[PDB]
RNA sequence: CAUGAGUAACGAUAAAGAGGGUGAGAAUCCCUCUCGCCGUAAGCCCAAGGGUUCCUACGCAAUGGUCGUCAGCGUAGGGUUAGGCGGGACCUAAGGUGAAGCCGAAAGGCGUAGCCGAAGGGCAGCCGGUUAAUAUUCCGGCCCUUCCCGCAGGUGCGAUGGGGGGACGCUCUAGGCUAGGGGGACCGGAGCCAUGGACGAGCCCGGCCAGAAGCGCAGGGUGGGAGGUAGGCAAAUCCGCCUCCCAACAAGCUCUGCGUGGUGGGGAAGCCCGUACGGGUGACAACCCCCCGAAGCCAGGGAGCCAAGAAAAGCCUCUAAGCACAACCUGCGGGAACCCGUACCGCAAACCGACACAGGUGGGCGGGUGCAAGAGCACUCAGGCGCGCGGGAGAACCCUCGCCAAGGAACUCUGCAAGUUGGCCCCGUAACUUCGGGAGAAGGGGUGCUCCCUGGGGUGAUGAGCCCCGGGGAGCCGCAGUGAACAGGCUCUGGCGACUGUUUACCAAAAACACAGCUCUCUGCGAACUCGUAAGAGGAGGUAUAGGGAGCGACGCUUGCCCGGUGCCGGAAGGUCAAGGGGAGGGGUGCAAGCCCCGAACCGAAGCCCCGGUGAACGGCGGCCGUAACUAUAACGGUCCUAAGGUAGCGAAAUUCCUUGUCGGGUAAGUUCCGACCUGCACGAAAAGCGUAACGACCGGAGCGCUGUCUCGGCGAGGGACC
RNA sequence: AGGGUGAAGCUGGGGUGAGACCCAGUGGAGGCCCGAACCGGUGGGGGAUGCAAACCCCUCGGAUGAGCUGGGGCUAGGAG
RNA sequence: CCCGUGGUUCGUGGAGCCAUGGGGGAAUCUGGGCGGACCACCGCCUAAGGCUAAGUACUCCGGGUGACCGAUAGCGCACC
């Protein structure tokens, strides 16, 4: 029932990284903003494998 | 390598008045030619309706000849592409090498002719205008030399030569009007190839369209949310514009446009 | 922390009952024995994604919707290793990046080139055996892969830049091979008659799989030269253009069948033991014969048809320049080859829905019997289960499903539903028609199984070897003979709409929107628009038979009356006004040259006024009065009014309120629909008008057929309800 | 999956001048027609603190095309 | 200096000075903006380049004090 989850060791994986974040300025930004606003870390880190 | 335009299927349900076509020629394409992406989307942002496809081959084309004006070529043959309004002949370059090339009023596989500096006033040469013989026949034509075959009269047969002054001689186009080119530019010789095409009559819409490649298209569209117009309702809405904030359907374009009085007279119009 | 509540609920009506076992306790664990449901899936398989877990050993207080000595649960320990499988050590498209470059107040926008970037390209192994556990990774048998050192033989070798080349629809499709079905009493084998019978071509099990190349089936992918070799595809013999010969069902060079080296496996029972995961196990095999074959493979076929089907290795082919004496082509020897990957789940309690949620989620035959055909049907093969809370009587009543008779819609807003009806073969088939068709119209009749005479397409002729109907004849047994499961109710008729369709994820199967096809009309390509801060793309490598704005919407007949107002299209003669150019002139300060305002005669851009044009352009198309031997209107009979004043067809309609209009038909009766009439509360051709076959999960009106549907239904089975 | 339909071309036989055009055989096209897997989801029915934040059943339409589908991408939120 | 604009207590005004987007378009100390829109005065300052300290801000981090808090207030957060 596509209940819109189902993600993508690719896709998923993909869309959202490091880099990624680092590339968009906003990306960096917000980046920045809550990696030490608040510790936590990444979830572009959040990945797996 | 001609093209039959009639045949046409029979009551294979409302598959009816489906014109078929042709060419005997029939080979399939030859070496230069690569394929264009997928456009109807572009520069990114997204534009004009319609739009879909439908299977992919994609052309290159000769549209410069001056470049040899001379080595004879003799039709390669018949043939064409997923483009164009009236076929084209592959031709084959007497110094080895080949190009496609319009395809003029029905020449004739392994014809030679060609062109530049004097060619015989014989449709299919081409030549610099100057070489007019005012009253005859051409298309590709080419305003603003080396700015390469500038009016490709697609399945245009329409070049129609038509007098001459300054460094200008005058021209009956498709559309019903007049321009000039300065001489040293340039005219396939003689006319183009289809226009039954143009005739051409195809079943179950949806089928044939999209096959086409084209979408749609919806005015007034109800909701008139957007479109332009009235809607919400059955009647034809009257302010009297159209889609993506419209002037109706009869008002200029042009202006200034040092294009304009510089050339061309005969005005916007026909009366079939 | 209470409350309905110890009632509602346990996740699918695919059922389970026994015996023994282990246990502190076992409906709910283990074996084993009866039994039902899958099987075309509840099969296995790759992949995804999950990422523990998988196993083996202990344990259960938490967790499973109670159990529970069971687990995917808890504790601990061990468990996947590959030059040849995959992915990178290579190729590239879309596509992202981006040295250049164009471009922004900034942050960026755009971007060739080179790069990144794919179960799209390309590439060198397979099978049999061994672990609690992983395998073409391990072992073993068999078959290779490139790269390095050498040597041996052989050459204009020598880029990746030129080229040729790998490269490609769809529909279909001849010919040829295993897979893979299937009968062999055909050979091997452990057994049996239990029961009236048969030990007899009886049952039951099996009768292969891999094998350098050597070779024998099929084909699967073409030219030798020479020369001119005014292109070269800048740089040169390689391609392509011209010419004269040989251009042979040609030798050419790339997958099957045999090979066969040869290895390996090899199952029924059967009974001995482990829970099982399992193993001995018969010589241990017999391992041959014949049948049917594909959408698979050879194969880049072959035909046909358009909407006419991707970019980087490999073979060559030259510079650089080395090579050419130590470059490449080719044998043998020697030596090398790393990085990340497997466990298992994995159409699903481990992947996605917050749950062991009956939802969804990609490709691989999909074993067999029967059915005309077939992944549908019914029973099954292997292989998989028994949904996880149980026992119990079984009343109300909703559920699910079965039977009815008498009548058979009156129920009812609606025949909603449900039943009728439906499998193929022959008899036969209406108004209308775009002669395609409405036909599965419609209405009949058929089939089962026996024996008998009679023709055929298979397979090495053709003789136990099979599939097509034969055909016909006599006859057999049931109420019953697609015998069960797959499986049309039908006819008439009217409004819309053409018909294929999409949608409205969340009611709204269906009109609307599509649309093919009509007309107006816009734009000269550096088109016109659409996004954009330029840059720029788009558009279109298209180029007015083309690319946009549109109202309509096959097709047939047919599109009439007004542009005085509105918009738009055309002409600036003139009236008209911004800035401006501008100077008359007034002005303050100036003792004064002067310095500085205000400044307005006249010239002055579109626009606006004005004059024509103008409907498939907005938008509209009338009002009243009078007269032909009489009794009824109709012709103008002139007038009031405006731009004229609605034609053709059309009418109480998906527009008539007076309306259940009036007639007619249907009918026991009908405001319902069909047909008329036509004083059209308020139709009219282009947002089309009248009509118009086929097609609708269209909406409405008849009527035949059938049917617990209705006259109340009445008993019945399965599930909760209840103990 | 599976089955029926049965155009165009062609081949031959038939009639003029040849020809139209006919008949027959071949053929075996998209519409498709019939109907599963596939894709949609009315028509009626069955849950209301339901297996479920949109379901199960009986049923039904398309069932080669504007078809359906896995992988890889771009457009996006006063914009798509 | 003309208009097109920013500043400034100035929102359009008799509206000054600095400041710039357009077009005009120069003076060396008798120079040239500035007090009074503007004109005659006196007065003022010396423009269209450059450098930096020192006194008010800020709180990550340290120290200290609190008619500032007691575990639902205090940072939400008193400790994997
Ligand atoms: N040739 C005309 C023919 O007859 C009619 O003409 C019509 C039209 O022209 C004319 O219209 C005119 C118009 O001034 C305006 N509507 C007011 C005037 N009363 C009227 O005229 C009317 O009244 C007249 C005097 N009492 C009579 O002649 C007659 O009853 C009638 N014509 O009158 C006719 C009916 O309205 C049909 N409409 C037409 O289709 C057909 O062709």
Same mark, same amino acid.
Request: include cysteine; proline fraction near 7%; aromatic fraction near 6%.
């Given at each position: 029932?596509?209940?819109?989850?189902?993600?993508?060791?690719?896709?998923?994986?993909?869309?959202?990284?490091?880099?990624?974040?680092?590339?968009?300025?906003?990306?960096?930004?917000?980046?920045?903003?809550?990696?030490?606003?608040?510790?936590?870390?990444?979830?572009?880190?959040?990945?797996?494998? | 390598?001609?093209?039959?335009?009639?045949?046409?299927?029979?009551?294979?349900?409302?598959?009816?008045?489906?014109?078929?076509?042709?060419?005997?020629?029939?080979?399939?394409?030859?070496?230069?030619?690569?394929?264009?992406?997928?456009?109807?989307?572009?520069?990114?942002?997204?534009?004009?309706?319609?739009?879909?496809?439908?299977?992919?081959?994609?052309?290159?084309?000769?549209?410069?000849?001056?470049?040899?004006?001379?080595?004879?070529?003799?039709?390669?043959?018949?043939?064409?592409?997923?483009?164009?309004?009236?076929?084209?002949?592959?031709?084959?370059?007497?110094?080895?090498?080949?190009?496609?090339?319009?395809?003029?009023?029905?020449?004739?596989?392994?014809?030679?002719?060609?062109?530049?500096?004097?060619?015989?006033?014989?449709?299919?040469?081409?030549?610099?205008?100057?070489?007019? #013989? /005012?009253?005859?026949?051409?298309?590709?034509? &080419?305003?603003?030399?080396?700015? @390469?075959?500038?009016? !490709?009269?697609?399945? =245009?047969?329409?070049?129609?030569?038509?007098?001459?002054?300054?460094?200008?001689?005058?021209?009956?186009?498709?559309?019903?009007?007049?321009?000039?080119?300065?001489?040293?530019?340039?005219?396939?010789?003689?006319?183009?190839?289809?226009?039954?095409?143009?005739?051409?009559?195809?079943?179950?819409?949806?089928?044939?369209?999209?096959?086409?490649?084209?979408?749609?298209?919806?005015?007034?569209?109800?909701? #008139? /949310?957007?479109?332009?117009?009235?809607?919400? &309702?059955?009647?034809?809405?009257? @302010?009297?514009?159209? !889609?993506?904030?419209? =002037?109706?359907?009869?008002?200029?374009?042009?202006?200034?446009?040092?294009?304009?009085?510089?050339?061309?007279?005969?005005?916007?119009?026909?009366?079939?």
């Amino acid at each position: 029932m596509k209940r819109t989850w189902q993600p993508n060791r690719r896709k998923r994986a993909k869309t959202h990284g490091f880099r990624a974040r680092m590339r968009t300025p906003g990306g960096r930004k917000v980046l920045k903003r809550r990696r030490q606003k608040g510790r936590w870390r990444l979830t572009p880190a959040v990945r797996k494998r | 390598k001609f093209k039959p335009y009639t045949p046409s299927r029979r009551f294979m349900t409302v598959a009816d008045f489906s014109e078929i076509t042709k060419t005997e020629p029939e080979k399939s394409l030859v070496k230069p030619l690569k394929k264009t992406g997928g456009r109807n989307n572009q520069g990114r942002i997204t534009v004009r309706f319609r739009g879909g496809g439908h299977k992919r081959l994609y052309r290159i084309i000769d549209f410069k000849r001056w470049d040899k004006v001379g080595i004879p070529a003799k039709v390669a043959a018949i043939e064409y592409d997923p483009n164009r309004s009236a076929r084209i002949a592959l031709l084959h370059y007497v110094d080895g090498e080949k190009r496609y090339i319009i395809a003029p009023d029905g020449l004739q596989v392994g014809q030679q002719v060609v062109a530049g500096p004097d060619a015989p006033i014989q449709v299919g040469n081409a030549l610099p205008l100057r070489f007019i #013989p /005012v009253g005859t026949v051409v298309h590709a034509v &080419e305003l603003e030399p080396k700015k @390469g075959a500038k009016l !490709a009269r697609a399945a =245009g047969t329409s070049a129609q030569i038509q007098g001459r002054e300054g460094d200008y001689v005058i021209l009956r186009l498709p559309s019903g009007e007049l321009r000039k080119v300065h001489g040293e530019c340039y005219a396939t010789v003689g006319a183009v190839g289809n226009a039954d095409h143009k005739n051409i009559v195809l079943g179950k819409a949806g089928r044939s369209r999209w096959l086409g490649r084209r979408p749609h298209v919806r005015g007034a569209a109800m909701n #008139p /949310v957007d479109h332009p117009h009235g809607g919400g &309702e059955g009647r034809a809405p009257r @302010g009297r514009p159209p !889609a993506s904030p419209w =002037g109706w359907q009869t008002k200029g374009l042009k202006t200034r446009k040092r294009r304009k009085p510089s050339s061309r007279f005969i005005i916007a119009r026909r009366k079939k």
